[PDB]
């Protein structure tokens, strides 16, 4: 009910590590395939926890 939103910008993100980390039980991506994340550039990334 009070989800915390974190801002991410001005950095390089190596999503390969996150995808390969087996600790993540559920890893679903809708607008983009998880594998392709390493060769894209975004205006900014929002993280909600």
């Amino acid at each position: 009910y009070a989800w915390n939103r974190k801002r991410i910008s001005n950095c390089v993100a190596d999503y390969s590590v996150l995808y390969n980390s087996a600790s993540f039980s559920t890893f679903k991506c809708y607008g983009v395939s998880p594998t392709k994340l390493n060769d894209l550039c975004f205006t900014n990334v929002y993280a909600d926890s």
Binding site: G31, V32, S33, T35, K36, D39, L40
Partner: protein, 98 residues
């Protein structure tokens, strides 16, 4: 006649209309490339560089269907216009001969 042609600008409206119609049809056909048609994006490279195979076939297919429809409409319009222009050209040939 020389003075009228040199002064008035609307004399050749018959030819100007043909030129404008063709240019406008081409402009519409080109602009049609910028429509999503329901896909996530209207850029094939962006679709391919974001989604993966099996997926992204839906997006490519939506774009294909939309663009194919646009091309078919353009070609049908061109065929009808060509028929009209051929009628005019046959009339002009008859006028020349007679």
């Amino acid at each position: 006649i020389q003075d009228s042609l040199s002064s008035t600008a609307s004399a050749l409206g018959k030819l100007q209309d043909v030129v404008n119609q063709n240019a406008q049809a081409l402009n519409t056909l080109v602009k049609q490339l910028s429509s999503n048609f329901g896909a996530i994006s209207s850029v094939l490279n962006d679709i391919l560089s974001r989604l993966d195979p099996p997926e992204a076939e839906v997006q490519i297919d939506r774009l294909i269907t939309g663009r194919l429809q646009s091309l078919q409409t353009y070609v049908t319009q061109q065929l009808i216009r060509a028929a009209e222009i051929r009628a005019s050209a046959n009339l002009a040939a008859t006028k020349m001969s007679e």
